[PDB]
Paper text:
In bacteria, high-affinity zinc import is accomplished by ATP-binding cassette (ABC) transporters, which rely on extracellular solute-binding proteins (SBPs) to acquire the metal and deliver it to the membrane permease. By this classification, SBPs that bind zinc, manganese or iron belong to cluster A-I, which is defined by two related α/β domains linked by a long α-helix. The ZnuA proteins of Gram-negative species primarily belong to group II, which is defined by zinc specificity, the presence of a long flexible loop rich in His and Asp/Glu residues, and metal coordination by three His residues and one Glu residue or water in a tetrahedral geometry. Here, we characterize zinc binding to the cluster A-I SBP ZnuA from the human pathogen Citrobacter koseri (Ck ZnuA) and present the crystal structure of the holo form.
A screen of additives identified hexatungstotellurate to contribute to larger, better-ordered crystals, as has previously been reviewed. These crystals belonged to space group P2, with six copies of Ck ZnuA in the asymmetric unit. With a formal charge of minus six, TEW often interacts electrostatically with positively charged residues and through hydrogen bonding in protein structures. Each TEW in the Ck ZnuA structure is in close proximity to Lys91 of four symmetry-related protein chains. In all six chains zinc is bound between the domains and is coordinated by Glu59, His60, His147 and His211.
Numbering used by the authors: 27 to 118, 143 to 313
Write the structure that this text describes.
């Protein structure tokens, strides 16, 4: 099997290795990328994976550990890829929420495909063809999203937790800023003040919760005000692995942003 660390890395691998081997996500639905640690049975899945896909040690900390035993032909480490490295952003030490960069996704699909062809050479036929389709969906989605999000350029909003840099920069969104960075921090207390003042001084159209964290803090700093409220799910927790899953992720996310920000 192809064992992906996070669900949207699954979405990608599931497209490339469709019909060739199954894909498996380690980080379960509704857990957060910051704050997991590998089950014994999750390490089994890694030890006997055909191919392992993850970002890199600055992101999925919890699995740097087990990935040192795995050799280079049996894994794809997306933060240290040829075409990705050059376009890593800074953390306002780089932002690693890469799985939302279509350019990076592309580069990842490529590298996955390469390694699978190597390991499973009698499936080259299908693999080559799965990839072609991916590149096509992905391209055609990047177009539709672009259009959907284009009218939200300018509209300022706030997000819980800083995950969306890559996506936001690429489609030209206009975030006023984030509540946290690591969302195991609260954050309080001045942070929450600076947001409040910004929201009541008109200035912001939407504020965005997340499903893997209590919206609790976001209602508040908003109640009373003319700010609308929504949610963003950066792990597409409610999307099934499949060919068209990663293109669905981006569309969903676009719709999440837009469903609140439209006007």
């Amino acid at each position: 099997a192809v064992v992906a660390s996070l669900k949207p890395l699954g979405f990608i691998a599931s497209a490339i290795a469709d019909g060739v081997t199954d894909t498996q996500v380690l980080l379960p639905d509704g857990a957060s990328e910051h704050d997991y640690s590998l089950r014994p049975s999750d390490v089994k899945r890694l030890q006997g994976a055909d191919l392992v896909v993850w970002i890199g040690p600055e992101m999925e900390a919890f699995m740097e550990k087990s990935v040192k035993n795995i050799p280079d032909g049996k894994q794809v480490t997306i933060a240290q890829l040829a075409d990705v490295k050059p376009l890593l952003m800074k953390g306002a030490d780089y932002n690693m929420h890469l799985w939302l960069s279509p350019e990076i996704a592309r580069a990842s699909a490529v590298a996955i495909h390469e390694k699978l062809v190597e390991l499973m050479p009698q499936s080259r036929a299908k693999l080559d063809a799965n990839l072609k389709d991916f590149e096509a969906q992905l391209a055609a989605t990047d177009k539709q999203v672009g259009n959907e999000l284009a009218p939200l350029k300018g509209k300022g909003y706030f997000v819980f937790h800083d995950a969306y840099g890559y996506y936001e920069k690429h489609y030209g969104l206009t975030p006023l800023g984030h509540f946290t960075v690591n969302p195991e921090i609260q954050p309080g207390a001045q942070r929450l003040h600076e947001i409040r003042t910004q929201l009541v001084e008109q200035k912001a159209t939407c504020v965005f919760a997340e499903p893997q964290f209590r919206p609790a803090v976001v209602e508040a700093v908003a109640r009373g005000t003319s700010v609308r409220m929504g949610t963003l799910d950066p792990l597409g927790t409610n999307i099934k692995l499949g060919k068209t899953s990663y293109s669905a992720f981006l569309n969903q996310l676009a719709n999440q942003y837009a469903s609140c920000l439209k006007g």
